Amino acid sequence: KRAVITGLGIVSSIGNNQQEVLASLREGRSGITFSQELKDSGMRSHVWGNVKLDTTGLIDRKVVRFMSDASIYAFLSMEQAIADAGLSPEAYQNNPRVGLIAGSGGGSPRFQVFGADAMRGPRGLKAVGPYVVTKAMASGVSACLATPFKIHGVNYSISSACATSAHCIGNAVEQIQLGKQDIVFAGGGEELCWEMACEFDAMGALSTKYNDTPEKASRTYDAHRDGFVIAGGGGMVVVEELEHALARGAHIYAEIVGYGATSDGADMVAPSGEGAVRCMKMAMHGVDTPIDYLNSHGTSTPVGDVKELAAIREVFGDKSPAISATKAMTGHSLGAAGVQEAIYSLLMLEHGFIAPSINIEELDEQAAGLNIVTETTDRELTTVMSNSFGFGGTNATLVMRKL
Amino acid sequence: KRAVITGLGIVSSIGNNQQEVLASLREGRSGITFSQELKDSGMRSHVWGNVKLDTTGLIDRKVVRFMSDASIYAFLSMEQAIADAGLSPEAYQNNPRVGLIAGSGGGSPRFQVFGADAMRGPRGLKAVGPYVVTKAMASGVSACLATPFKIHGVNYSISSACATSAHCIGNAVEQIQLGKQDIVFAGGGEELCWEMACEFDAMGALSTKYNDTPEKASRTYDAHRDGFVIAGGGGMVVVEELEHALARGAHIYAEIVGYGATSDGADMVAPSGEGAVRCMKMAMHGVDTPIDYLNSHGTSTPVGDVKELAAIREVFGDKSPAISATKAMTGHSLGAAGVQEAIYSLLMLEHGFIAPSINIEELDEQAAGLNIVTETTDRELTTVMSNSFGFGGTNATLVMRKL
Ligand SMILES: C=C/C(C)=C/[C@@]1(C)SC(=O)C(C)=C1O
Ligand SMILES: C=C/C(C)=C/[C@@]1(C)SC(=O)C(C)=C1O
Ligand SMILES: [Cl-]
Ligand SMILES: [Cl-]
């Protein structure tokens, strides 16, 4: 069975819905701002890709009481995706053929910490309250969505650090391929908080030299890049079996024609490059059209950026796709990056443009021989690819093509 | 393609390897002990199923520096499983056909809380150090294993709260069915700590009336049960494509002949039963032999224990299987429970016995008319079923059959 994407939803540093996101991608607009929270926490990195949305009252009191911010962002993204897919409650609720696979990289460090802080204070268990497990547990995002949306089919999270939501989408495709589900909502969410951000800063992973000019801090492939800019948000796509989609007159963005998932088996916090080569080739297998555009993982990290370019050069030789790292605009939403970047790639495919790789003032030498696009470019695209990698040497690649 | 289990490994409250666990299961031996740590934290529950193993020095410094306890337990279990399977590094390392899918329910609240506590002191980032992300991330159990074991295939965690490691095993089976992998190491780990346990005590989920008699606190189906006894540990199984196993002269414990995964879409912290019925039925589809023994999820919770029994009655009608709840001995290892219980079930199948459901002093009225086995019973078994459920209404069932 073939799998297609029939709806999308997104809450991102560059837009609270697909219209805002589309506009930001075309304008090369930064979603990065200064964070007093990060500064106050004692961090060296004081910049972030924040969600600019008051979520007060957007979710029913009895539903939101179980949720951390990752789940809030994923839930709002799922609402958007359902509306976009034209799915009525009757179409998707209480239906064993309809599932949900969505995760987070971090879960909720904020709520893990809150539980322990509260426990150590004067009210102990009463301060902790009865909602911390569903906030803090690694599967919060799937649990907190599958329940209120009345999902009856598969319900779990994939967790693979910064590749999380890409593997969620690939696993959704597998459920369609195995004939087990007709629809799977796939994606993820990530909270933004010093509790988690400080652990990345403590390993030197985050940008620290550009706090005074937050919009210039995330600068994938620039020779003066100095680490990623942390971000939060959510995204969800509707992954649907092809015949089921056509039969209901769904709007189809693209077919997922390739999914690679591989492992480096090498280093914990630096990529081998070879795993990414294998992952991309796996996702390309049997795909009879060229890759027109590649949304790189492209974190703005000295080692990572060029390791991935070396991998791309090995896979494509002298026939580079157009490449841009949208993280230079959006920052790195960790477990939510894969689905948000799939969505950016789908919007490029749907609207016929390539988003720019911004903030390259001096292009890294190793981008020579490749097609790094630094200006918004109108172009009819047919096949797009998006890479996601995570600590632990975990790799995901998705290839999406017009029908 | 057919999937078989060809090796197993376990670190549990009732033994540090399969020899010790087999002896405990046969003896009805409790793994539950009084915890001064839980009491000192201010919790109401003072009992736990602790791993009784000094793990100091068992793992290379450069590997273990990235790890939390969940990953240590899973890593040791995976070493045992490789040795049990008879796999040389030549066979399983740097092999694109060999993967790893293993997770935890909670990641590491201990290390997340350590990060935040350290950061909030006078030394900030320097006190946190560079190892907290990998110790605290949700995917630690897969990341920290796929890397040192030189895994090149799939590498990610499934997370689904108390169903986590059962969904990991089922997803491994799917990899074999899709023809993508020949071997997938599947399982999970969970740390044991007040930081996480207090979240469950705060929702009233933990046993609190039996602290003076720790070995009696976990008492699935007993009329005076009063919640679960939290535990930690790990487990790993080698899931392997059948022809690949036969060709190498593998020792085959069982074939995974069924895998159910469903969703309640109902309540966050209580099961509907309806989802469980569908999950068991899904796992039995095409399985042409009766269930000889069912290892229930059976947590020792007032609502959960009997909701699952009602679902069992609906699925099996007038032919109910022998049942036991091994958590009355072992406690509830959360994300590690699914793989550990699959392993207890495989030991029962391999050695021909049913482990007892202990501490039933007065059987719940809603458990009447079922064969809840309360004394170790030698019996030749052929087909066994094991259920795992988690918060968020996530359900998994595995059915395993002699080849
Ligand atoms: C095995 C280590 C890997 C893939 C590291 C990468 C490139 S993936 C990522 O999101 C960041 C920030 C990195 O540094
Ligand atoms: C949807 C909620 C569910 C399945 C709750 C269960 C029965 S699963 C579990 O491990 C425990 C302790 C429970 O209470
Ligand atoms: Cl347009
Ligand atoms: Cl024996």
Swiss-Prot record, chains A, B:
GO cellular component: cytosol
Induction: Mainly activated by FadR, but minor repression is also conferred by FabR.
Pfam families xref list: ketoacyl-synt, Ketoacyl-synt_C
Catalytic activity: a fatty acyl-[ACP] + malonyl-[ACP] + H(+) = a 3-oxoacyl-[ACP] + holo-[ACP] + CO2; (3Z)-decenoyl-[ACP] + malonyl-[ACP] + H(+) = 3-oxo-(5Z)-dodecenoyl-[ACP] + holo-[ACP] + CO2; hexanoyl-[ACP] + malonyl-[ACP] + H(+) = 3-oxooctanoyl-[ACP] + holo-[ACP] + CO2; octanoyl-[ACP] + malonyl-[ACP] + H(+) = 3-oxodecanoyl-[ACP] + holo-[ACP] + CO2
Active site: C162, H297, H332
Residues that span the membrane, as ranges: none
Its EC number(s): 2.3.1.41
Domain called Ketosynthase family 3 (KS3): residue spans: 1-402
GO MF: 3-oxoacyl-[acyl-carrier-protein] synthase activity
Pathway noted in the entry: Lipid metabolism; fatty acid biosynthesis
Subcellular location: Cytoplasm
Alphabetic keyword roster: Acyltransferase, Cytoplasm, Fatty acid biosynthesis, Fatty acid metabolism, Lipid biosynthesis, Lipid metabolism, Transferase
Any one GO biological process: monounsaturated fatty acid biosynthetic process
Complexes and interactors: Homodimer.
Record-stated family: Belongs to the thiolase-like superfamily. Beta-ketoacyl-ACP synthases family.
Function: Involved in the type II fatty acid elongation cycle. Catalyzes the elongation of a wide range of acyl-ACP by the addition of two carbons from malonyl-ACP to an acyl acceptor. Can also use unsaturated fatty acids. Catalyzes a key reaction in unsaturated fatty acid (UFA) synthesis, the elongation of the cis-3-decenoyl-ACP produced by FabA. Has an absolute requirement for an ACP substrate as the acyl donor, and no activity is detected when both substrates are based on CoA.
Protein name: 3-oxoacyl-[acyl-carrier-protein] synthase 1
Organism field: Escherichia coli (strain K12)
Gene: fabB
